[PDB]
Structure formats: C-alpha cells, structure tokens
Amino acid sequence: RILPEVKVEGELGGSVTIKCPLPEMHVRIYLCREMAGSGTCGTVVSTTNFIKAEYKGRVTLKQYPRKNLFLVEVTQLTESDSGVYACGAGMNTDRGKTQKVTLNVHS
Amino acid sequence: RILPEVKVEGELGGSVTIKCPLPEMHVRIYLCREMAGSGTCGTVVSTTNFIKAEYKGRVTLKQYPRKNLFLVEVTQLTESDSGVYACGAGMNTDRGKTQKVTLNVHS
Amino acid sequence: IRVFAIPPSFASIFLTKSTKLTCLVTDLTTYDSVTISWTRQNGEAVKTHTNISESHPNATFSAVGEASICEDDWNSGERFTCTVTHTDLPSPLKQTISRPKGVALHRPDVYLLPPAREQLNLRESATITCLVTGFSPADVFVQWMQRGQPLSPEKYVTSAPMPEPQAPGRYFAHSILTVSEEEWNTGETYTCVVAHEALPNRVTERTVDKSTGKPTLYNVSLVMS
Amino acid sequence: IRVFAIPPSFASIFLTKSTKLTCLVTDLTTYDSVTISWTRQNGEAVKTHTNISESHPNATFSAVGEASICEDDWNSGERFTCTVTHTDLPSPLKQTISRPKGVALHRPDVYLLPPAREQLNLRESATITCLVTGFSPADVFVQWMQRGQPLSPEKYVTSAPMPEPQAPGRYFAHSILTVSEEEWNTGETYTCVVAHEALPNRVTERTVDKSTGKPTLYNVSLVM
Amino acid sequence: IRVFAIPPSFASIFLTKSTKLTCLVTDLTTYDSVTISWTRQNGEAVKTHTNISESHPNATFSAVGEASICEDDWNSGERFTCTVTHTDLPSPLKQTISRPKGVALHRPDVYLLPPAREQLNLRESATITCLVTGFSPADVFVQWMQRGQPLSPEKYVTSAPMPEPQAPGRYFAHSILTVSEEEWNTGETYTCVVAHEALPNRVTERTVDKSTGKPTLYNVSLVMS
Numbered sequence A, B: 001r002i003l004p005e006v007k008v009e010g011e012l013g014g015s016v017t018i019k020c021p022l023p024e025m026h027v028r029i030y031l032c033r034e035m036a037g038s039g040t041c042g043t044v045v046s047t048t049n050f051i052k053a054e055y056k057g058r059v060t061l062k063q064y065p066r067k068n069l070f071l072v073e074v075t076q077l078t079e080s081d082s083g084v085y086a087c088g089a090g091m092n093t094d095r096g097k098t099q100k101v102t103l104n105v106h107s
Numbered sequence C, E: 001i002r003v004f005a006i007p008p009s010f011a012s013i014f015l016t017k018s019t020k021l022t023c024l025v026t027d028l029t030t031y032d033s034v035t036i037s038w039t040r041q042n043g044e045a046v047k048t049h050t051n052i053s054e055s056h057p058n059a060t061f062s063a064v065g066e067a068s069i070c071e072d073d074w075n076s077g078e079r080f081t082c083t084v085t086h087t088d089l090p091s092p093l094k095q096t097i098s099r100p101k102g103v104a105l106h107r108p109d110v111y112l113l114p115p116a117r118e119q120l121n122l123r124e125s126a127t128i129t130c131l132v133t134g135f136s137p138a139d140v141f142v143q144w145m146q147r148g149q150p151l152s153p154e155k156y157v158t159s160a161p162m163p164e165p166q167a168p169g170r171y172f173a174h175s176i177l178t179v180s181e182e183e184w185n186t187g188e189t190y191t192c193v194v195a196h197e198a199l200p201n202r203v204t205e206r207t208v209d210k211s212t213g214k215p216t217l218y219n220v221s222l223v224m225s
Numbered sequence D: 001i002r003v004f005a006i007p008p009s010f011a012s013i014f015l016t017k018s019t020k021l022t023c024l025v026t027d028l029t030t031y032d033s034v035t036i037s038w039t040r041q042n043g044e045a046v047k048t049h050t051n052i053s054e055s056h057p058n059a060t061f062s063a064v065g066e067a068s069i070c071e072d073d074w075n076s077g078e079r080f081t082c083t084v085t086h087t088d089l090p091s092p093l094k095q096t097i098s099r100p101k102g103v104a105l106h107r108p109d110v111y112l113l114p115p116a117r118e119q120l121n122l123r124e125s126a127t128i129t130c131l132v133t134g135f136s137p138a139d140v141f142v143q144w145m146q147r148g149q150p151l152s153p154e155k156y157v158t159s160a161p162m163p164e165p166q167a168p169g170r171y172f173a174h175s176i177l178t179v180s181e182e183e184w185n186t187g188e189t190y191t192c193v194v195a196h197e198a199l200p201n202r203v204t205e206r207t208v209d210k211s212t213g214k215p216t217l218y219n220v221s222l223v224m
C-alpha cells in the first residue's frame, strides 16, 4: 500500500493539483474520495465527463504524457472535511486505487 | 521460525548485501519480499532468470559454495521501504523461507 | 531468380481492416531501378509499389512490390499477377496467386485454462492459456485484451495451427499469456479474443478471473419443515 | 425532381460486410429512360444501378441508384456524388455524400439486466434487456447470440438512440429480447453482441444466465 | 557434393535406446560404387551402415549412413566425421559433427492442466494439456501413459519448442490428449511423462484425474421443526 500525503492551506480558491501516476495504458483514470459514512470509496472525477454534484466546475484534470503525470486540480476549496483521495485506473474503482493521499484544507 | 534480524541505513547510492543460508547443491534459492497488503510473501528474484519489474537491473545474486553464503546485492535503493525479505529455497515459496530480515532505508 | 508471393492473410486482413498483397524478387543481381509492379485480373494498373528496400548484402537482391486492393475483390475469386522484368530476365514475369477457395467451414470453439496451482505456489508467474479448436480453415488470429484495450505482442505467444489428432481436417491452436503472479491474485478479465472467418460476427471473446474457477463449498440446505 | 441520398451506415455496412451508398429521387415525373450516374471525387466509373424502382402512387417516378466501394474510402472523406438526369429537368441534378467528420468517439459500455422477479411469477415470458449507453456517435447495432447460433430478428427489438439526459454528447440505446421462463430457468446462456466504431475491435459482447447473481460460494436452498 | 549430418535426436535416443547418427549425403551426381563410413575423434572406422538409400527424385544422389555407437562416446564431446567417397569428388568428403554444447541446461517443469468445465458440458471430448515450460535446450519428449501403459502416438498431439516470451534461450512446448467425456468422469487417471537431459533422473511425470482439484464439500442441512 503506497500512500503519499498532500496537505494544503488555501481557505478560498487556493487549490492544489494532486499528482497521480499514469498507467499510460489508455484505461479509464479517476480520483476517488473515500466515503467515511459508508466506509467505501466514492468517485468524484473520472475519465468520463462526470463531476461530483457539489464539485461541479471546481475540479479539473490534466494528463501529461510528457511527464507521465495526472494532475487533479481544484481551484476553490470550501474548507470541507478533506478525507482520503485515491488515484486509480480501470473499470472497477476500489480495485484500481493505486495511491492514496490526505491533505488538510485549513492549515 | 528463526529471525536473523539484519538492518541498514540505506539511501540511493548505497548498496545492500543480504546473506542467506546456501541450502547446498541446487534447489531454487530465492529472496522473497513480504506483501503487506496480501499478507503473504512475494518473489522478487529466484534461481531462474526472474527479476521483479521495479527491481529490473537493480538486483544481482552471488552464490558462494566456498563459504556456503548466498548474497543478494542491490546497487540502488530508494523509497522501497525495507519491509520483510525472506531467504528461501525449493519450489514452493511460502514453505521455503528462513532469514526473515527487515531493514530501514532512510536511517 | 526467385519470384515468390505474399497473398493477404486473414490476420493481415483483420488487424488493419484492409487487404495488402505483395510479391518479392530474390537472388537477382544487385542492380537498381528494377521493374517490379502489380496488376489486376483485367490487367489494370495498381497503386505504386512504394517503399522499395535495399539489396541483400550477401550479393543478392531484396525488393518487394506491393498493392492495395480492397477486400471486395479478394472474396470474389479473381486471381492477381505482378509484373517482374529486370536486366537479368527482360521478359515480364507474372506471379499468379488466389485465395484457397474450396474449404469447408467450422466454428472455432474457444476455451481458457487458468494457471495451475503449482504456478501460484511458486509465486513467480502465471500462464493463462487460450485454446482454440475445431475450425476448418487453417488461419486464425488470436490476441489478448486486458481491461478492454490491447496488450503488446511481446507478452503473449501464439502457436501455429496444427492438425487434429482425431478430427479429419480441423485444427487447433494455443496461445499463452504470461502475466505477473500478484496481478492475477488481484484479478483481471484477461479477455482472449479470437478472429476467424467461420464465426458469425468473425469475433469471439472469452474471459476468466481468479473468481471464476472457485467452486461452492456449502450446500447449506436449511429446511424448517 | 428532389434528390434523397442514404449514405452507408455502420449497421448496414457491418451486417452484410458490404458497403453500399445509395441515392433515390422523388417528385420525378413518370417517364422512362431515367439516368442515374455515380462519380467519386476523381469521378471514375461505378457499378450500374439495377432493379430500378417504379412510379410512386401519386403519379411521379422513383429512380434509385446504388454503388459499391472500398470501405476505407468512405472513412477517408471521399464525398461521392450521384447525378440524376432525366427529361423533366431544367438543369441536371446532383447530390454529394460525405462522412460526417468532426464527431467524437466514445466506447459503448454494454450492460445486461436480467428480468425482474415480478415478471418471473406469471410464468409466461421473461424479458432480458441489453443497455447500450454512453456512446458517440449513434449507429450501434445489437444482436442476440444464443449459444453460438444467432436468433431471428423478430425475437428481439432495438430502439433508435436518444441523447443522454446528463451527458451532453453521449447517446444511449435499449434492446430487449423475450424468452419463456421454462427455458430461462434452465440456465442456458444468452449473449448481447454490440457493434460500434469506438470499440477497439468494433465488436463487444456480454453474457447472462439465471445463475449469475448467485454468490457461487454456497447455495442455501431452504426447502419445506 | 553436400553432406548433411543428422544427429541422433533425444526423442530417438530415448524411444529406441540404440542411438545412431546419420550421414545424409545430399546432392551428389548419381554414380555407383558409393561407400559411406564414420570415424570418431581417433579417426578409426566403424560398422558399415545398412539400408542403402536410392537416388533422389531431383536427378541427384541422396544416401544415408547410420552407425550405432556407445552413448557415452557420443556424449563425451568427441568429434564424429562421416567419410564419403565418390567418382566426381577430387577428395573424399570429411563431414564433422559433434554436440552443439555450451548451453545453460535448465530442467523442464511440467504442469498439468485439466479440461475446463465449459468444455465438460457438451460431453464430447476432454482435452488434457501437459504444458512444459522453462527448459533448455530445444529438445524434449512427451508420452502419455494410462494405468502404467503408454498410448498410441495418434491420440495425443505435441507441439514444437517455441521460444519463451520473457526468457531468451529457454523454450516451451504443449501436448494435448483428447479423451471422451465419460472416462474422465469415471476418474481414471492419466500420466504425462517428460524426458529431457536436464532432468536429474532424465525422466519426470505428473498425474491427474477427476478428484485432483475437488476440495471438501460441507453439505450441511439444518432443521428445527
């Protein structure tokens, strides 16, 4: 279980573009924030055009084959409870979660 | 059940040598690294030409019948946390392990 | 002088979704600006034989003349010829080829065999084998699709078609995919996809996973009565 | 004289493996010796139209002309033209056909829903539904493979694509096939096969059987 | 003028136990009074061969000279030269052959694989596959014995040694035995035996039947009025 930790600080629009590994392999890629209440993971951004309802317009994704990187950037942070976000690939989500991070929104 | 715990500081330019009992003659001697997620052991290099993908070109083996010592030499170490590496022999992997060693990489 | 021909094969027709036919001249003298081209049954000129190669450095000649005629004629029965004239042989030689019409049809039935537990006990490398059997036409194209998009051809090996032990004219074939051991324990589809011209849709997929051969262990027939 | 060209469609080109672009005409006055010609961008020869249509019931004639090409040409942007010439025109008509480039591609994921439990109580007919969703463009064509051999095209129904509710350009389409419960309970497999451009092999498929949602570990089958 | 040398194949050395090396003299002009002999490293003559070959249909000469020798002398690494005389040859042909030694021997690892249950639904034919991987050099023999006695070569099929994808210099093979459904359902065992040099005892084998994989099945049956 490989796991980094990006803790941020911007209380407003001070975003952060999480860095995720690229399979370079042309499968679906996604970021999944774990649902604390359910105890499982929940998709927020995927290769498809999905955006989470509360995160509409506030989250975008960039793929970098030149650097083999996957940057998920959130422009504005609502200072909400920032759980654990896992980068992943493949059809099934909880199988595909490669790396997991957690970063504080406040300080 | 023996626990010949051997450690190291381990960085990037440092090279680590792991001593294993030579079982004598030839019986598939290998070095296996415990998989924390699976809870079992996973082969990294064996008597056959198999070498683990991330460890390609970074691990070499030296058998010493003169001293009956099996040296596993890693030229470059990095973030690969020294979890548990087990020296083993025979066809089956989990049955054939001994030296359950673990070593740090940072300090 | 050697004038040999490469007619399009079913795999070649399939992967590119187009038909290409070539003829090669070999053991000619090392001379440039030779005349090698292709033509149709009626004698119509074809697209130019671009990408001419260099002579074989053992004092022989290596050049191929190709042509791109679409599949609409290859399934009709019109044999083709390529024009070959050179300083050695000034007479334009014709190389006649056609598809082997007159062969029965049989549906290639497909199975997947997962690696033996002995493989997993080594924790070393699994070898999933796709077996194809009982198809009358010789040629067949098998590849491996993981998570629905292809894998490089250096990770799987396909055996050549071989005659059947008991069947009169049908054939069988093997493909082996050597996955990493820990990845199979995690579980992936590893779909073996086969293309053969006796199939209805000319494509058939099979798939197996770690949780595919697991049998039930509790026939907990509980009855209150 | 009104031109009406039907270009090749993926379902049509794929079901018979024979490309065929066609153009008919309406409003053409009923008269013989009708002229239908086909040309490419280079305007070379074509296949001569055969089995010409007769006059419409409203006292006008129908002229239809089809042609066979190489399939890669249609995907190469070649805008094949058909010229309609008759003795009732002030100037000869023509209509040019091109493939609609600029469209995005999206792999149609194929999901197969088993019949509901309520339906499997009346004991007359189950209905398996194949849900081709999230694809682009719209030109899918499904078929129901039943243990190797196909099924008659009157035992299943497909629907024209509709735009996706939430996804902007993604379409979707349905398909149903009716069985009877006394064979569905037997457990023979049913497969939905889908053909579309975006697929890596232009063909995908899924399978279903009555013992699919069962957990396959144990089969707690309480009796009386 | 040509003299190919057919080495004794490990299939033949193991099937016959009477190793013989052949001197296939090919492409001479057809003339009579042709004697073919052999010498080892010491250069002395050997036993005269039998089964004199006839002229080739290609209007040339093809002859075969086989000498039965002690197997240790053949595996000693000695040089064995066929000596050929003829009327058109200014000098006798001196054809040297030996072991192509200098290869890293690796013991084969057999793994049996039983037919998939998807196959065991038509109840027509089961196909047991004796996958052999990780062996060098490219030579192996496979037999199929049932109840201790072997089977006809026409019932099973063996492939050719293809190179392994992820291991250069190391090959793999296949082998299919087709039984009818009921015999495999009765649980009758089948044995795949592999002969190869690198084996510690030169012979290994594996066994299979209906009950190899079958685990324990706790069919419980609760009941309480």
Ligand SMILES: *[C@@H]1O[C@H](CO)[C@@H](O)[C@H](O)[C@H]1NC(C)=O
Pocket (backbone or CB within 6 Å): C219, C221, D221, D223, E219
């Ligand atoms: C499983 O239990 C059911 C209960 O009715 C029985 O009919 C069936 O034969 C059992 N299967 C086996 C393999 O014992």
